[PDB]
């Protein structure tokens, strides 16, 4: 029992099985949903989430990792309801998703105070439940590594040091934020193999992608050009660093498009198993 | 019946009486409160809010204007509870409080779409209740008039044009954001006397303040130096543009400090009546 699951007992990382490493059941701006609820329909969101999870399970998915955190409208009680309706293994996370500055709350607060929020979610539970976080999610984009973005990165490293949970990032595939995320985390003492640098499948600069993977971190490739890059990377022997996902105010695309395209281009079932079973296993090990 | 009140029938602006034009019952970051509720105690916030309203009522306050909006954690149901417990006249508002960029929701959305949210709150009601907004609140600070800040300003003007409700702003007293807010609103066709440029009491550059007032807008002076500026402005004949308030993650300061200090420096009760009764009356007229 190493990985916490929403609405279930924890499981050993070795029993995670076929895993979708980056799927959002739902996403929204906390402030907009609180202030203008007329814009949203939770019943439709629920139905859509249940349907997508069921579709994934029909293709043999055992575990889904949902990296929705602050900024994207994480709601543990919604997640519970989805689990009860499907029986899926669902890993929730903690963290903060920002591109520029932190909410006003964080004005004049230390990196340690931010880290304590993450550790609270990991050790005590999320949003007043006993459902605990199994990873930390962070982001950077076009604005680059700002002061507040760097605070969040360093907070994530502190959380990892204390709890050992892995770190997932969102980066911009065109401005080296991904490489900077990796460097800052590793300088703080994070094991590179406990980092997934995501949203890279958007670039064709395979050298940039290979550089990240070479430094020991997983690369998130989350169409023909995207599949082309994916295949390119596979044939170059980067299967064991590749993690594929689909990633608001589908899941079948992997099974209806990506994997079919791969297999009819050589890649066997041992490669598919590596990307979807072995890679997640190591990440959470 | 022109001004909407939380939990009550609307009233004529002439019956507003002694008004505190800018008091926050409660404030918080929506995203932080949703994601880490352990940080907050709503029961303590409620008790504190009730106590402050009761203190104000003991000094003869009849109406309180609470400009908490998106970004600051507006909660109409909390506001209702306070009204039920005190019997205060409470004016709620709509709008958006940002310094740099808007939530992700607003990516690729028009000024008209933003305006429609404000108009929804004014015409239909707030957060799924029949409690309607009686003004629009906007902000700018150190970053100045950004692209998204300007969007919100122009949305506020559209709302005012359609519904006639007045506009309250937060500005930085040291970078001319207040003057720019006023200019942009007036160019869009907003009557200058339907604008309150706030958070000016922080500067001693009385010429800057006088410039705003001269252009026909109310000036929000929201200690000795602050009172000094206030007195300075009063003796220069700017009483009829002055609005005073106290303005998170007291109300008596006005009655225990400011007003006492004023009166023992000449200003009579007709000036006090102008600032706290006549100025609000015109603003909402
Ligand atoms: Co992302
Ligand atoms: Co303000
Ligand atoms: Fe994502
Ligand atoms: Fe305020």
Query: For chain A, first and last CA: distance in Å?
Result: 11
Distances (CA, A) of B239 to B42, B205, B236, B268, B270: 38, 17, 8, 12, 10
Phi and psi at B94, nearest 5°, equal: -130, 180
- In sequence order, what are the residues at sequence separation of 6 or more whose Cβ sits closer than 8 angstroms to the Cβ of residue B140? B99, B146, B149, B153, B169, B170, B171, B172, B177, B180, B181
- CA pair distance A203, A181, nearest whole angstrom: 17
The token pair at B74 is 């507006």
CA of B30 to the centre of ligand 2 (A): 17
Q: Does B69 touch chain A (CB under 8 A)?
A: yes
Q: After which residues is chain A broken (C to N over 2.5 A)?
A: 222, 247, 249
Distance between CA atoms of residues A69 and A94, nearest Å: 6
Q: How far apart are CA B229 and CA A142, in angstroms?
A: 43
Residue B200, CB-side half-sphere exposure with 13 Å CA sphere: 31
Pairing of strands B218-220, B94-95: unpaired
Judge whether B55 lies within some domain.
yes
Does any domain span residue B58? yes
Judge whether B205 lies within some domain: no
Separation CA A189–CA A130 (nearest Å)? 29
- Whether residue B31 lies within 8 A of chain A, CB to CB, comes out as yes
Q: Indicate the angle between helix axes B147-163 and B177-188, nearest 10 degrees.
A: 40
Which phi and psi (to 5°) does residue B183 adopt? -60, -45
The candidate with the shortest Cα–Cα distance to A240, out of A213, A204, A207, is: A213
Of A35, A71, A128, the CB nearest to B38: A128
What tokens were used for A219?
Answer: 């690369």
Sheet holding A89-92, edge to edge: A19-20, A63-66, A89-92
List Cα–Cα distances, A104 to A114, A195, B173, in angstroms: 13, 28, 19
Contact A50, A79 (CB under 8 A): no
Q: Does residue A27 belong to any structural domain of this protein?
A: yes
- Residue A169 falls inside a structural domain: no
Domain that holds residue B52: 1-92
C-beta atoms surrounding B252 within 10 Å? 13
| Virtual torsion, Cα B182, B184, B188, B191, nearest 10 deg | 0
Going by the DSSP 8-state scheme, the letter that residue B141 receives in this structure is -
Query: d(Cα B32, Cα A133) in Å, to the nearest integer?
Result: 16
The phi and psi torsions of B32 (rounded to 5 degrees) equal -75, -40
Return left, alpha or beta for A18; rule: phi > 0 is left, psi -120 to 50 is alpha, else beta.
Answer: beta
Alpha carbon of A113: minimum distance to chain B alpha carbons (Å): 12
Separation between Cα atoms, residue A76 and residue A130, nearest integer Å = 10
In a domain, residue A81? The reply is yes
Q: Nearest-CA residue of chain A relative to B94?
A: A35
User: Residue B24 annotated as binding?
Assistant: yes
Number of domains chain B is built from: 1
Q: How far is A132 from chain B (nearest CA, A)?
A: 13
Q: Is A75 annotated as a binding residue?
A: no
| Backbone region of residue B121 per phi and psi (left: phi > 0; alpha: psi in -120 to 50; beta: other values) | alpha
CA A40 to ligand 4 centroid distance, Å = 28
Contacts of A95 (CB under 8 A, 6+ apart): A67, A69, A70, A118, A135, A136, A137, A138, A152, A156, A168
Say if A65 falls within a structural domain: yes
Structure tokens at B5: 């009140």
Cross-strand partners of A136? A94, A167
- Domain assignment present for residue B41? The answer is yes
- Cβ atoms of A51 and A95 within 8 Å: the answer is no
Q: Which strand (E) or helix (H) includes residue A65?
A: strand A63-66
Q: How many helices (H) and strands (E) does chain A have?
A: 12, 11
CA distance A63 to A86: 11
Find the length of chain A.
285
DSSP character at residue B167: E
Rg of chain A over CA atoms, in angstroms? 18
What's the CA dihedral at B66, B72, B75, B76 to 10 degrees? Answer: 30
Regarding beta strands B195-198 and B167-170, do their DSSP bridges make them parallel or antiparallel, or are they unpaired? parallel
Q: Does residue A218 contact residue A241 with C-beta atoms inside 8 Å? A: yes
Cβ–Cβ under 8 Å, residues B82 and B50? yes
Number of helical (H) and strand (E) elements in chain B, helices listed first: 12, 11
Distance from CA of B38 to the nearest CA of A (A): 7
Tell me which long-range contacts B277-281 makes (C-beta under 8 A, separation of at least 24).
B277/B16, B277/B17, B277/B18, B277/B19, B278/B240, B279/B21, B279/B218, B279/B240, B279/B241, B279/B242, B279/B243, B280/B16, B280/B19, B280/B21, B280/B63, B280/B65, B280/B243, B281/B13, B281/B14, B281/B16
- CA of A98: how far to CAs of A69, A72, B143, B249, in Å? 10, 9, 17, 19
């Amino acid at each position: 029992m190493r990985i916490p699951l929403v609405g279930k007992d924890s499981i050993e990382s070795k029993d995670i099985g076929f895993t979708l490493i980056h799927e959002h059941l739902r996403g929204f701006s906390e402030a907009v949903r609180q202030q203008w609820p007329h814009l949203y329909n939770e019943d439709e969101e629920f139905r859509n989430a249940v349907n997508e999870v069921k579709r994934a399970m029909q293709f043999g998915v055992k575990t889904i990792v949902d990296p929705t955190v602050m900024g994207l409208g994480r709601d543990i009680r919604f997640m519970e309801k989805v689990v009860k309706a499907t029986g899926i293994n669902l890993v929730a996370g903690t963290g903060i998703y920002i591109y520029i500055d932190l909410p006003f709350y964080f004005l004049n607060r230390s990196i340690d105070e931010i880290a304590d929020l993450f550790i609270h979610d990991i050790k005590e539970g999320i949003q007043g439940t006993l459902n605990k976080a199994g990873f930390v999610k962070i982001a950077a984009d076009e604005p680059g590594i700002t002061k507040d973005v760097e605070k969040v990165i360093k907070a994530a490293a502190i959380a990892n040091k204390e709890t050992k949970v892995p770190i997932i990032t969102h980066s911009n595939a065109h401005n080296n934020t991904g490489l900077e995320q990796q460097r800052i985390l590793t300088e703080e003492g994070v094991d590179p193999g406990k980092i997934l640098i995501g949203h890279l499948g958007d670039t064709d600069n395979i050298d940039y992608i290979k550089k990240i993977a070479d430094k020991g971190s997983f690369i998130g490739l989350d169409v023909d050009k995207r599949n082309e890059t994916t295949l390119r990377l596979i044939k170059d022997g980067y299967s064991d660093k590749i993690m594929i996902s689909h990633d608001i105010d589908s899941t079948t695309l992997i099974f209806e498009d990506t994997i079919p395209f791969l297999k009819r281009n050589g890649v066997n079932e041992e490669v598919i198993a590596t990307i979807f079973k072995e890679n997640p296993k190591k990440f959470f090990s």
